[PDB]
């Protein structure tokens, strides 16, 4: 489909406590002398 015309929604979303959404814990020559 062409779908000419799409509105945008710019807001201050994605607010969290610096954690990961997943229930699971957030995944993290040499010298030689002559």
């Amino acid at each position: 489909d062409e779908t000419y015309g799409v509105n945008v929604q710019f807001e201050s979303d994605e607010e969290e406590g610096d954690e990961d959404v997943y229930g699971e814990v957030r995944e993290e020559c040499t010298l030689s002398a002559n």
Partner: protein, 156 residues
């Protein structure tokens, strides 16, 4: 306590006594500005040499600055001892002391740097090469690969 103020007043009285009557209208203010400038210059380790200042007045200013500097250093040390011991002091005293000590410590640091420049390196050449041989033997024993310059395509 207030030795500096009395010293300044006495030197001003002595200078203005030996002063022509018809000229002392503004020369008193000029020489006071000169005294303040000399004190500031000593506090900053910068040369102070007024070209047009006659040498007797200049020598009196030098003596006054020497006396005030001795009193300044002594009272700064005494106040630091009082504060470190635990005596009751207000903010102004501590602030002033810190300023004085800062000036004194930078004076001492400049003297130390100049002493290093004059007396050369304090570590002897053979002492330095012994330290270097120790370090190279350690790093060779550790098979330590030296850290390269941050690569342009550094992954991290």
């Amino acid at each position: 306590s207030h030795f500096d103020l009395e010293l300044r007043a006495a030197v001003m009285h002595d200078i203005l006594d030996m002063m022509p009557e018809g000229i002392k209208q503004n020369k008193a203010r000029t020489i006071l500005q000169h005294l303040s400038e000399a004190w500031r210059c000593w506090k900053a380790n910068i040369p102070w040499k007024v070209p047009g200042l006659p040498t007797p007045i200049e020598n009196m200013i030098l003596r006054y600055v020497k006396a005030k500097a001795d009193w300044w250093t002594n009272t700064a040390h005494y106040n630091r001892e009082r504060i470190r011991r635990g005596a009751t002091v207000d903010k102004t005293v501590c602030k002033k002391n810190l300023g004085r000590l800062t000036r004194l410590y930078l004076k001492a640091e400049q003297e130390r740097q100049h002493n290093y420049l004059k007396d050369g390196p304090y570590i002897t050449a053979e002492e330095a090469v012994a330290v270097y041989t120790t370090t190279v033997h350690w790093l060779e024993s550790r098979r330590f690969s030296p850290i390269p310059f941050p690569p342009l395509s550094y992954k991290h």
